[PDB]
Amino acid sequence: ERTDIRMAIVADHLGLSWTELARELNFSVDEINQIRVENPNSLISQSFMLLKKWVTRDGKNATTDALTSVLTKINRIDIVTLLEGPIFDYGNISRSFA
Numbered sequence: 001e002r003t004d005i006r007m008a009i010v011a012d013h014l015g016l017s018w019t020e021l022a023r024e025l026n027f028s029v030d031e032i033n034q035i036r037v038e039n040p041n042s043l044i045s046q047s048f049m050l051l052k053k054w055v056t057r058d059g060k061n062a063t064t065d066a067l068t069s070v071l072t073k074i075n076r077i078d079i080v081t082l083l084e085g086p087i088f089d090y091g092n093i094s095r096s097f098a
Helices: 002-024 029-038 043-061 064-073 077-084 086-091
Strands: none
Touching: 002 029, 002 043, 002 064, 002 077, 029 043, 064 077, 064 086, 077 086
């Protein structure tokens, strides 16, 4: 539940960026379309389910560090500082979101 709360926070900040995060995470346009179809009225819902699929997919490799690398690439540094800051125990959700 704690880990879910943290993903929700990320998802809230993501907004429209989630599709760019997904792309950088090497998700396909089909996978992105599907997330949007399954979560039609909420960018936050969409971003949250992207984060969930990422964790299901990459498991132990779904790390705070993997995330900040991509978020840096797509110019969402505001989320990087969040992930590196005290609210995220300085990168320790418990380092992986799994």
